Amino acid sequence: SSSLEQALAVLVTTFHKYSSQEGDKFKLSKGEMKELLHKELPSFVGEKVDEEGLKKLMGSLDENSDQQVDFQEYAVFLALITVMSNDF
Amino acid sequence: SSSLEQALAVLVTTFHKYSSQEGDKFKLSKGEMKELLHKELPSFVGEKVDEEGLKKLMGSLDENSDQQVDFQEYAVFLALITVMSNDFFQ
Ligand SMILES: [Ca+2]
Ligand SMILES: [Ca+2]
Ligand SMILES: [Ca+2]
Ligand SMILES: [Ca+2]
């Protein structure tokens, strides 16, 4: 595996690491996303995940209004955080 | 750095490794993309980057019609292939 492929694999595995804990094993709940942000993106959220921001994040990603983020919906998040990592 | 932050940093450094080769240092030319595909995404392109497929890929990725792939266009490409990777994985 190339370095890029290894990195892409971590994008995949990370989603499932959090999604598979609670509820639907293939969707990220609010709570699973909060954990993902705090543990995986501390540079973006710091030590405390802001409740209102989390609600708006979830709402913007959750295109089918099931209150969860599926992997297709999560790909939008991946694109955003990739751009953010380049710029900031 | 978290495993996810380390992964994102690889996506950023990989882009610039290839984009900075020639021409605009912040955009992937068709040639730069060909190499990136060949060396970095062989599990998606394989051993040869196909020429017709390369032209189709560039066209599909190139939302601003400048015949190159910029960072945002690349970020969308990778998010699409990770949805592909997740399909293969799941
Ligand atoms: Ca879940
Ligand atoms: Ca959803
Ligand atoms: Ca270039
Ligand atoms: Ca372009």
Swiss-Prot record, chain A:
Q: Where does Ca(2+) 1 bind?
A: 27, 32
Which top-level group of life is the source organism from?
Eukaryota
| Tissue-by-tissue expression | A subset of epithelial cells including normal human mammary epithelial cells and keratinocytes.
Q: What else is known?
A: This protein binds two calcium ions.
**CDD domains in alphabetical order:** S-100
Instruction: Briefly state the protein's biological role.
Output: May function as calcium sensor and modulator, contributing to cellular calcium signaling. May function by interacting with other proteins, such as TPR-containing proteins, and indirectly play a role in many physiological processes. May also play a role in suppressing tumor cell growth.
Report domain EF-hand positions: 11-46, 49-84
Residue positions binding Ca(2+) 2: 62, 64, 66, 68, 73
Give the Gene3D superfamilies listed for this entry. Answer: EF-hand (1.10.238.10)
Induction details: By growth factors in early G1 phase and probably by cell-cycle regulation in S phase. DNA methylation probably plays a direct negative role in suppressing S100L gene expression in tumor cells.
Q: Which UniProt keywords apply?
A: Calcium, Metal-binding, Repeat
Its GO biological process annotations read: endothelial cell migration
Subunit-level organization:
Homodimer. Interacts with FKBP4. Interacts with PPP5C (via TPR repeats); the interaction is calcium-dependent and modulates PPP5C activity. Interacts with TPPP; this interaction inhibits TPPP dimerization.
Under SUPFAM superfamilies, the record lists: EF-hand
Q: What name does UniProt use for this protein? A: Protein S100-A2
Any one GO MF term held by the record is:
transition metal ion binding
**InterPro entries membership:** EF-hand-dom_pair, EF_Hand_1_Ca_BS, EF_hand_dom, S-100_dom, S100/CaBP7/8-like_CS, S100_Ca-bd_sub
